[PDB]
Amino acid sequence: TIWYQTNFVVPPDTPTEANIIALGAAQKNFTLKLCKDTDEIQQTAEYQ
Amino acid sequence: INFTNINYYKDSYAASASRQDFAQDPAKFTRPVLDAIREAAAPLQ
Amino acid sequence: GYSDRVAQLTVGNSTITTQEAANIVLSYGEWPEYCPSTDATAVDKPTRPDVSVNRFYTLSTKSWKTESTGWYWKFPDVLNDTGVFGQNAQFHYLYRSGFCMHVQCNASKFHQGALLVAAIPEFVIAASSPATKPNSQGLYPDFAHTNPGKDGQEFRDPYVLDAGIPLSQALIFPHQWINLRTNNCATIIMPYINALPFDSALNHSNFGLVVIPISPLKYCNGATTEVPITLTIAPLNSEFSGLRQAIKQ
Amino acid sequence: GYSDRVAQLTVGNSTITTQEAANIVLSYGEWPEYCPSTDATAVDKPTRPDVSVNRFYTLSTKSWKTESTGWYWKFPDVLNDTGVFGQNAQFHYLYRSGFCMHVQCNASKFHQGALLVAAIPEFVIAASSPATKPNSQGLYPDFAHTNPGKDGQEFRDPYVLDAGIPLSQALIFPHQWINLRTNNCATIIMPYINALPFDSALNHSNFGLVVIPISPLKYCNGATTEVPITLTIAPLNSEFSGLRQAIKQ
Amino acid sequence: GYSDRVAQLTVGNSTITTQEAANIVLSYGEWPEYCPSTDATAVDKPTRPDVSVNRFYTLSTKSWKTESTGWYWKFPDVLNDTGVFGQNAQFHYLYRSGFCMHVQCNASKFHQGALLVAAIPEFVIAASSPATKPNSQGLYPDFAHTNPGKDGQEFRDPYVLDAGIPLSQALIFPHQWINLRTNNCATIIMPYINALPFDSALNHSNFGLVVIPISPLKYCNGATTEVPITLTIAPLNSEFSGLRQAIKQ
Amino acid sequence: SAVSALADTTISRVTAANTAASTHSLGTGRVPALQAAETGASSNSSDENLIETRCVMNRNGVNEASVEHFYSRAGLVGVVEVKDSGTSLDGYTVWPIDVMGFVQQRRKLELSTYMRFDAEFTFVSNLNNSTTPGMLLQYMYVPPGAPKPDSRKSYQWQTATNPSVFAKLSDPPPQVSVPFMSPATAYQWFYDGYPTFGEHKQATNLQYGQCPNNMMGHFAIRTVSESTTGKNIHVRVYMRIKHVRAWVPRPLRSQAYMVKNYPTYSQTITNTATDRASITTTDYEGGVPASP
Amino acid sequence: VETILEVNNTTGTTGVSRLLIPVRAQNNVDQLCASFQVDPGRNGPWQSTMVGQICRYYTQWSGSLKVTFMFTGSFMATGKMLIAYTPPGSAQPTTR
Ligand SMILES: CCCCCCCCCCCCCCCCCC(=O)O
């Protein structure tokens, strides 16, 4: 969760709303196991 | 006693998969920069 | 142990200075190099016009707007009609080179927004079909969208990079951000990446160069509205072989 | 030979980062330490819950206004009902600990004002009597003013620290300023100061933690009006002895 | 070459003396130990509140009657709401510990009867269904029977341990008898047994602690009728990790 | 001798990175948490520098995440119907070798831009009712340029040079190992270019992206029969990739495929992440709070 | 390799807008900005990540994760955020 520790303070004549971009990744001790088939994309017919 | 990784045919591409050369070098995708940045440092100083 | 904010890139008779620079991305940690004799296949002696073609070319300037989607270029295609590089690409069948792409976008400390500058190898452009089966013309993109030239082409669906792949994972490619609060330029040095030592600079485009606004440009009334984005590139270690009559396309 | 503006305080599972920090005040040049066997008096083995209680607790956020007088907390009292520290303070008769108080207040470069953050040992609160002789109730402050809990108590007369001593000399105590043009935080590491090796965390409050606006908060129309002040503290080297039934107050 | 009848168990600030003791059962010949760094998996530093939680807790006293069936407790569940141990079990996600269970039952030299005190790891409680097929509610025991708390739960069918396994073979578990003519207590030291280094003290109960009267209590008119059975336990080498908000159940 | 060679063939385990013990740090100028994502580099922050960690001698094996193990798994790449009944009494069929017809193999392959590998092709052939009567089949590989058969009796089935496999349906599935056959250094799943010169002003422009270095001919399959058999045969081709070399990883495809040789997504773009109610809702009930 | 999380995966948000966590000047204190689960293979913000898409090719995973937040406001905009990771057992925290 992301909370406002303090406010988002701006001077006059500057946008009061901005964006935060989150970039996710793994650490050096990351590991995977038991390779399987994904469920991301489906197919109902050959691509001919 | 393991009896595997033996090729029975004259052509080398007939051998089984080469699963004894695991190498990990993530620096070419995670730190593709010129000036190496120390972890404990402010990157843009 | 850190990176300085100022930088100067000098190649050929051109020099680019920047005072708010993040770093310089060396794609895949490999510098551009000439084709080694161990990997070459053509027997003709290549030509290496050192300083006449390996130099910075300021090519196109697009105006960043609040509803902009982004633009993309193809590296060999964007330089095929400019300078001594364009001539050597037209007169020779074979060509290979790296490049140093430099995207410039400055704004006041009162603007905001972030661009994603990535160099995509083999950036095959997709067409979005309206669910039509019978292999209509709208199944393949026209030549204006695959080889945009020096003007570039603005994205239709930046969310899928106009290629069906998610934009969020485009950071797997050599990339850099232009965050207006942090830096005003993005530098990417890219070596020659191809399954062949040489290739035609006219048919094959080795890299796609995308500039996509992730966080839209926002400012308040009174600030400068026209915020341009300039693309400057420079071939590195460019060779050509197979001389013949100049071929345009 | 100088102090860096950035700092990171990591204790327990909590981490506090700041990018505009003045310094870190080490009160009286002594670090918090466990009670040496030469100075201890109780024979029961103390418990030292290392990382469960020695950690940063963000407790209260007060809104700084242009007519604010200031607020004060009492260190053992403000943590007696939070987390594993509060439980150990309720289950044990004896307690001792230092702390690292961290007050956070950020504002734009267009605001102004300065806070005085001081850690006052044995901050006995006074009552202001209306010149009444016959030992009326208004001769002694109620419990809400002596032990404000985690919400703190706002000063009635900050000029005399609500204790009859002049505010101008409060700098004799371990203090730090939060000058909005210079820094946005104040850090004070305080060792356990008491005439006894251990003491009750419920009856006795070792330190008072005051935050008083000397230069009032001023800004122009259009700036963010709500400027909060957050108090984060962390016990250091906290021990407890004399286990029995949990006692609330 | 023998075992003395007197014994004293001192852990924490608690001390238990007995003058008619059989022996002390060390379950599976392994002492309770902290998780070695070779077997640990969580990276957070664990807390080890040495003497505040590793201490004897007298929890429940059941009255032994001539028609009593027996009672059972679950070790982590019986201490989840008592003392500093209960708090650390509620504030932390992960937990591991051994224990030293001590069951006390004294009677005159004119009473008779024998209890079976066993510590059953993974004591999964069964429900006795009235031969009903369609997966009715009466196919699984309610939460009051699986986690009885500190009051324990009296057996419904002690002959099958309320688990479908014969009571006669319960001696395969670390056990001890309380034979009124021989001894008046039973001590079992149990190390942390689980397929994981740490686990939740709220969901998973590592051990079941049963006290079953094999030979019923018999006496003649005039003797004291109320013969209690007191359960005193003490965690050993208890660690906790994964601090967060206190969770009750 | 070579006894030392065969002994060192078991998969040796290399473990994941260990975690070292760490303590609290109170000072300035040392900020391992602050990063600059604009530099295009991923954060080098370690757990040791953001929390207080313990010493964990990690022993989790990482060998299964290698490129070889990820790819050396035979998946379906082609379904060939040898029609010999009804309106098509061919008894033979010439299938253009393309491994981009089925999603599971295609998505895995397009993780990388260039790939150089050998393959082990397996043919699982049977009738429509899944039975396998003894029926002699001939699977002839027709390299690019070799004459393709046009009937079940044509001379091309003599196979005096073309590699050919004869096997009945009742036999175990035929299996052959195919080398890295390509004029290039690697197969190129993405070719941002055109195969020939020209204006490329065509109305369809179907040649865009077609690199002939990947086109490796056809697999001609027939039943060795004297006349029509009246039975349709389905040949499922499975490709196992070995001795893999991958280059330039790419984003995994997120839109549904539409055609075989082209990236082409529908105009109704599907989101990469499934929607939720708001930006502050998660579906995890958790436990009961001790003191709310 | 760090890739963009699709945190703003809300109904109605379309295109590149789904990759942005909106932050603005608050009228009250201690407000919730955004939240998401850190299960990589779970349907949600992690679906748009390279780690999230490779995890779906495997049954089990292990190791520490990493989220890098980049603020894309004005140079003049200041602020402080508390980004907390709550271990299992508890629902999403209701207060800071
Ligand atoms: C005896 C019959 C054996 C069959 C021989 C099979 C030969 C296959 C060639 C190797 C296949 C890999 C390259 C495929 C690339 C084409 C994909 C595409 O771009 O559409």
Short mmCIF file of N, CA, C and O in Angstrom, two decimals, chain E residues 138-220:
data_model
loop_
_atom_site.label_atom_id
_atom_site.label_comp_id
_atom_site.label_asym_id
_atom_site.label_seq_id
_atom_site.Cartn_x
_atom_site.Cartn_y
_atom_site.Cartn_z
N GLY E 138 -22.22 -32.56 10.17
CA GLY E 138 -21.71 -33.49 11.15
C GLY E 138 -20.60 -34.37 10.62
O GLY E 138 -20.28 -35.41 11.21
N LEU E 139 -20.00 -33.98 9.50
CA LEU E 139 -18.86 -34.69 8.95
C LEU E 139 -17.53 -34.08 9.36
O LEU E 139 -16.49 -34.71 9.16
N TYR E 140 -17.53 -32.86 9.91
CA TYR E 140 -16.32 -32.19 10.31
C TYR E 140 -16.52 -31.52 11.66
O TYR E 140 -17.58 -30.95 11.92
N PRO E 141 -15.52 -31.58 12.54
CA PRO E 141 -15.68 -30.99 13.86
C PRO E 141 -15.62 -29.47 13.81
O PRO E 141 -14.91 -28.89 12.99
N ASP E 142 -16.38 -28.84 14.70
CA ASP E 142 -16.41 -27.40 14.76
C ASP E 142 -15.10 -26.86 15.32
O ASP E 142 -14.23 -27.61 15.78
N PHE E 143 -14.96 -25.53 15.29
CA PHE E 143 -13.72 -24.92 15.75
C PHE E 143 -13.51 -25.09 17.24
O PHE E 143 -12.36 -25.10 17.70
N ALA E 144 -14.59 -25.23 18.01
CA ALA E 144 -14.44 -25.39 19.45
C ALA E 144 -13.77 -26.71 19.80
O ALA E 144 -13.15 -26.82 20.86
N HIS E 145 -13.88 -27.72 18.94
CA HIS E 145 -13.27 -29.01 19.20
C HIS E 145 -11.86 -29.12 18.63
O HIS E 145 -11.08 -29.95 19.12
N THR E 146 -11.52 -28.33 17.62
CA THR E 146 -10.18 -28.40 17.06
C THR E 146 -9.21 -27.50 17.81
O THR E 146 -8.05 -27.87 18.03
N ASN E 147 -9.66 -26.31 18.21
CA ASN E 147 -8.85 -25.36 18.97
C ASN E 147 -9.60 -25.04 20.25
O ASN E 147 -10.33 -24.04 20.32
N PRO E 148 -9.45 -25.86 21.30
CA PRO E 148 -10.26 -25.67 22.51
C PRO E 148 -9.85 -24.46 23.33
O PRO E 148 -10.59 -24.10 24.26
N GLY E 149 -8.73 -23.83 23.03
CA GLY E 149 -8.29 -22.70 23.83
C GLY E 149 -7.54 -23.16 25.07
O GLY E 149 -6.84 -24.17 25.06
N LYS E 150 -7.70 -22.40 26.15
CA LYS E 150 -7.04 -22.74 27.40
C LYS E 150 -7.89 -23.62 28.29
O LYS E 150 -7.35 -24.21 29.24
N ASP E 151 -9.19 -23.74 28.03
CA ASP E 151 -10.02 -24.60 28.85
C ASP E 151 -9.92 -26.06 28.46
O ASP E 151 -10.34 -26.93 29.23
N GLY E 152 -9.38 -26.36 27.29
CA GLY E 152 -9.32 -27.72 26.82
C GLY E 152 -10.69 -28.24 26.44
O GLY E 152 -11.71 -27.60 26.62
N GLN E 153 -10.69 -29.45 25.90
CA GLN E 153 -11.91 -30.11 25.47
C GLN E 153 -11.88 -31.54 25.98
O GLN E 153 -10.86 -32.22 25.84
N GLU E 154 -12.98 -31.98 26.56
CA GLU E 154 -13.03 -33.34 27.08
C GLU E 154 -13.36 -34.32 25.97
O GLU E 154 -14.14 -34.02 25.07
N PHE E 155 -12.73 -35.49 26.03
CA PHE E 155 -12.87 -36.47 24.96
C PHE E 155 -14.30 -36.97 24.86
O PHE E 155 -15.00 -37.12 25.87
N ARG E 156 -14.74 -37.21 23.63
CA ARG E 156 -16.02 -37.86 23.38
C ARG E 156 -15.87 -39.38 23.38
O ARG E 156 -16.62 -40.08 24.05
N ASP E 157 -14.88 -39.89 22.64
CA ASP E 157 -14.57 -41.31 22.58
C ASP E 157 -13.08 -41.47 22.84
O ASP E 157 -12.28 -41.55 21.90
N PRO E 158 -12.67 -41.53 24.10
CA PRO E 158 -11.24 -41.67 24.40
C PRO E 158 -10.65 -42.96 23.89
O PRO E 158 -9.43 -43.04 23.71
N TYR E 159 -11.47 -43.98 23.64
CA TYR E 159 -10.95 -45.26 23.19
C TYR E 159 -10.30 -45.15 21.82
O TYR E 159 -9.36 -45.90 21.52
N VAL E 160 -10.76 -44.23 20.99
CA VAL E 160 -10.19 -44.01 19.68
C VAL E 160 -9.53 -42.64 19.59
O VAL E 160 -9.32 -42.13 18.49
N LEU E 161 -9.22 -42.03 20.73
CA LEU E 161 -8.54 -40.74 20.80
C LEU E 161 -9.30 -39.65 20.05
O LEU E 161 -8.71 -38.62 19.71
N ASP E 162 -10.58 -39.86 19.78
CA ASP E 162 -11.37 -38.95 18.95
C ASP E 162 -10.72 -38.74 17.59
O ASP E 162 -10.91 -37.71 16.95
N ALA E 163 -9.95 -39.72 17.14
CA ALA E 163 -9.26 -39.61 15.86
C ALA E 163 -9.28 -40.90 15.06
O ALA E 163 -8.61 -40.98 14.02
N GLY E 164 -10.01 -41.92 15.50
CA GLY E 164 -10.05 -43.18 14.79
C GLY E 164 -8.84 -44.06 14.97
O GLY E 164 -8.80 -45.14 14.38
N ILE E 165 -7.86 -43.64 15.76
CA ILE E 165 -6.68 -44.45 16.03
C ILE E 165 -6.82 -45.05 17.42
O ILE E 165 -7.34 -44.39 18.32
N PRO E 166 -6.38 -46.28 17.64
CA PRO E 166 -6.61 -46.92 18.94
C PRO E 166 -5.80 -46.26 20.04
O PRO E 166 -4.63 -45.91 19.86
N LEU E 167 -6.44 -46.08 21.19
CA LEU E 167 -5.76 -45.49 22.34
C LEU E 167 -4.61 -46.36 22.81
O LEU E 167 -3.60 -45.84 23.30
N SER E 168 -4.73 -47.68 22.68
CA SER E 168 -3.71 -48.58 23.19
C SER E 168 -2.36 -48.33 22.55
O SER E 168 -1.33 -48.60 23.17
N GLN E 169 -2.34 -47.82 21.33
CA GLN E 169 -1.08 -47.54 20.65
C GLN E 169 -0.63 -46.10 20.80
O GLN E 169 0.39 -45.72 20.22
N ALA E 170 -1.35 -45.29 21.58
CA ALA E 170 -0.92 -43.91 21.80
C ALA E 170 0.42 -43.84 22.51
O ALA E 170 1.03 -42.76 22.53
N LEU E 171 0.89 -44.94 23.08
CA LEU E 171 2.20 -44.97 23.70
C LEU E 171 3.33 -44.88 22.69
O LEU E 171 4.49 -44.77 23.09
N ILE E 172 3.03 -44.93 21.39
CA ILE E 172 4.05 -44.68 20.38
C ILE E 172 4.45 -43.22 20.38
O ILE E 172 5.52 -42.87 19.88
N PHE E 173 3.63 -42.35 20.94
CA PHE E 173 3.93 -40.94 21.10
C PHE E 173 4.69 -40.71 22.40
O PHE E 173 4.64 -41.54 23.31
N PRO E 174 5.40 -39.60 22.51
CA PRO E 174 6.03 -39.26 23.79
C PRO E 174 4.98 -39.15 24.88
O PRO E 174 4.12 -38.28 24.84
N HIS E 175 5.04 -40.04 25.87
CA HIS E 175 3.98 -40.17 26.85
C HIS E 175 4.58 -40.32 28.24
O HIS E 175 5.78 -40.47 28.41
N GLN E 176 3.70 -40.30 29.23
CA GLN E 176 4.05 -40.61 30.60
C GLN E 176 2.77 -40.90 31.36
O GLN E 176 1.72 -40.33 31.07
N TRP E 177 2.86 -41.80 32.32
CA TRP E 177 1.73 -42.15 33.15
C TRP E 177 1.77 -41.37 34.45
O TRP E 177 2.84 -41.04 34.97
N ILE E 178 0.59 -41.06 34.97
CA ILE E 178 0.48 -40.59 36.35
C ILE E 178 -0.24 -41.67 37.13
O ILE E 178 -1.48 -41.70 37.18
N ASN E 179 0.51 -42.57 37.74
CA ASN E 179 -0.05 -43.62 38.57
C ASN E 179 -0.08 -43.13 40.00
O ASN E 179 0.97 -42.86 40.59
N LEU E 180 -1.28 -43.02 40.57
CA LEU E 180 -1.43 -42.35 41.86
C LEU E 180 -0.63 -43.03 42.96
O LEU E 180 -0.24 -42.37 43.93
N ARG E 181 -0.38 -44.32 42.84
CA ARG E 181 0.43 -45.00 43.84
C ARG E 181 1.92 -44.75 43.66
O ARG E 181 2.70 -45.07 44.56
N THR E 182 2.34 -44.21 42.52
CA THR E 182 3.75 -44.07 42.20
C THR E 182 4.20 -42.62 42.09
O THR E 182 5.17 -42.24 42.75
N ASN E 183 3.52 -41.81 41.29
CA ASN E 183 3.94 -40.44 41.08
C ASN E 183 2.72 -39.54 40.98
O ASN E 183 1.59 -40.01 40.82
N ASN E 184 2.95 -38.24 41.07
CA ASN E 184 1.88 -37.25 41.02
C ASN E 184 2.09 -36.21 39.94
O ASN E 184 1.43 -35.17 39.96
N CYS E 185 3.00 -36.45 38.99
CA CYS E 185 3.25 -35.49 37.93
C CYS E 185 3.77 -36.21 36.70
O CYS E 185 4.18 -37.37 36.77
N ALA E 186 3.74 -35.51 35.57
CA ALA E 186 4.24 -36.03 34.31
C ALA E 186 4.88 -34.89 33.55
O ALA E 186 4.24 -33.86 33.32
N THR E 187 6.13 -35.07 33.15
CA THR E 187 6.89 -34.02 32.47
C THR E 187 7.30 -34.51 31.09
O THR E 187 7.85 -35.60 30.95
N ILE E 188 7.02 -33.70 30.07
CA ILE E 188 7.37 -34.02 28.70
C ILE E 188 7.98 -32.78 28.06
O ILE E 188 7.30 -31.76 27.92
N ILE E 189 9.25 -32.87 27.68
CA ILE E 189 9.92 -31.82 26.93
C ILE E 189 9.80 -32.16 25.46
O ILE E 189 10.24 -33.23 25.02
N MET E 190 9.21 -31.26 24.68
CA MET E 190 8.94 -31.53 23.29
C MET E 190 9.61 -30.49 22.40
O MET E 190 9.39 -29.29 22.59
N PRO E 191 10.43 -30.91 21.44
CA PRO E 191 11.02 -29.95 20.50
C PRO E 191 10.02 -29.56 19.43
O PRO E 191 8.98 -30.19 19.26
N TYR E 192 10.35 -28.50 18.71
CA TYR E 192 9.48 -28.03 17.64
C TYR E 192 9.49 -29.04 16.50
O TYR E 192 10.52 -29.25 15.85
N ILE E 193 8.35 -29.68 16.26
CA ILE E 193 8.21 -30.68 15.21
C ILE E 193 7.24 -30.14 14.18
O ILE E 193 6.05 -29.95 14.48
N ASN E 194 7.72 -29.92 12.96
CA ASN E 194 6.89 -29.43 11.88
C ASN E 194 7.68 -29.57 10.59
O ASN E 194 8.91 -29.55 10.60
N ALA E 195 6.96 -29.71 9.48
CA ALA E 195 7.61 -29.80 8.18
C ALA E 195 8.15 -28.46 7.70
O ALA E 195 8.76 -28.41 6.63
N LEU E 196 7.95 -27.39 8.46
CA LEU E 196 8.41 -26.06 8.13
C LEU E 196 9.25 -25.52 9.27
O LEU E 196 9.02 -25.88 10.43
N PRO E 197 10.22 -24.66 8.98
CA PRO E 197 11.00 -24.07 10.08
C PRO E 197 10.16 -23.19 10.99
O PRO E 197 10.25 -23.30 12.21
N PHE E 198 9.34 -22.32 10.41
CA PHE E 198 8.39 -21.50 11.16
C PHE E 198 6.99 -21.80 10.66
O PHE E 198 6.80 -22.40 9.60
N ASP E 199 6.00 -21.37 11.43
CA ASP E 199 4.61 -21.54 11.03
C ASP E 199 3.76 -20.60 11.86
O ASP E 199 4.21 -20.02 12.84
N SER E 200 2.51 -20.45 11.44
CA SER E 200 1.58 -19.57 12.13
C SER E 200 1.12 -20.22 13.42
O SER E 200 0.66 -21.36 13.42
N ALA E 201 1.24 -19.49 14.53
CA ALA E 201 0.76 -19.99 15.80
C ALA E 201 -0.76 -19.96 15.91
O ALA E 201 -1.30 -20.48 16.89
N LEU E 202 -1.45 -19.36 14.95
CA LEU E 202 -2.89 -19.23 15.02
C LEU E 202 -3.60 -20.33 14.24
O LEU E 202 -4.55 -20.93 14.74
N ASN E 203 -3.16 -20.59 13.01
CA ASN E 203 -3.82 -21.60 12.19
C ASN E 203 -3.40 -23.00 12.58
O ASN E 203 -4.25 -23.87 12.83
N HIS E 204 -2.10 -23.25 12.64
CA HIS E 204 -1.57 -24.59 12.81
C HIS E 204 -1.27 -24.86 14.27
O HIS E 204 -0.64 -24.04 14.94
N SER E 205 -1.72 -26.01 14.76
CA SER E 205 -1.39 -26.48 16.10
C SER E 205 -0.42 -27.64 15.97
O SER E 205 -0.76 -28.68 15.40
N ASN E 206 0.79 -27.46 16.48
CA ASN E 206 1.85 -28.44 16.25
C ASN E 206 1.61 -29.71 17.04
O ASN E 206 1.86 -30.81 16.54
N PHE E 207 1.13 -29.60 18.28
CA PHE E 207 1.01 -30.75 19.16
C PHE E 207 -0.34 -30.75 19.84
O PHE E 207 -0.90 -29.70 20.16
N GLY E 208 -0.86 -31.95 20.05
CA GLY E 208 -2.00 -32.17 20.92
C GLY E 208 -1.53 -32.78 22.22
O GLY E 208 -0.67 -33.67 22.23
N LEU E 209 -2.08 -32.30 23.33
CA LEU E 209 -1.67 -32.71 24.66
C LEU E 209 -2.87 -33.37 25.33
O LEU E 209 -3.79 -32.69 25.78
N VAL E 210 -2.86 -34.69 25.41
CA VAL E 210 -4.00 -35.45 25.91
C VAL E 210 -3.71 -35.95 27.31
O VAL E 210 -2.57 -36.26 27.67
N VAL E 211 -4.75 -36.00 28.13
CA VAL E 211 -4.69 -36.57 29.47
C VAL E 211 -5.91 -37.47 29.64
O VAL E 211 -7.03 -36.99 29.83
N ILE E 212 -5.70 -38.78 29.58
CA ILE E 212 -6.79 -39.75 29.50
C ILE E 212 -6.68 -40.69 30.70
O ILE E 212 -5.63 -41.30 30.90
N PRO E 213 -7.73 -40.84 31.49
CA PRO E 213 -7.71 -41.80 32.60
C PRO E 213 -7.93 -43.21 32.10
O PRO E 213 -9.05 -43.59 31.73
N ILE E 214 -6.87 -44.02 32.11
CA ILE E 214 -7.00 -45.42 31.72
C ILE E 214 -7.64 -46.22 32.84
O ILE E 214 -8.69 -46.84 32.66
N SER E 215 -7.02 -46.22 34.00
CA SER E 215 -7.60 -46.86 35.18
C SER E 215 -8.42 -45.83 35.94
O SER E 215 -7.85 -44.84 36.41
N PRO E 216 -9.73 -46.01 36.07
CA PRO E 216 -10.56 -44.95 36.64
C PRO E 216 -10.19 -44.63 38.08
O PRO E 216 -9.63 -45.46 38.80
N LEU E 217 -10.50 -43.41 38.48
CA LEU E 217 -10.24 -42.96 39.84
C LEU E 217 -11.20 -43.65 40.80
O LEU E 217 -12.42 -43.56 40.63
N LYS E 218 -10.66 -44.33 41.81
CA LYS E 218 -11.47 -45.03 42.79
C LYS E 218 -10.95 -44.72 44.19
O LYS E 218 -9.74 -44.64 44.40
N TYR E 219 -11.87 -44.55 45.12
CA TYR E 219 -11.54 -44.31 46.52
C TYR E 219 -12.74 -44.72 47.36
O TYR E 219 -13.81 -45.03 46.83
N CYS E 220 -12.55 -44.73 48.67
CA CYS E 220 -13.60 -45.10 49.60
C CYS E 220 -14.19 -43.86 50.26
O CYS E 220 -13.61 -42.78 50.24
#
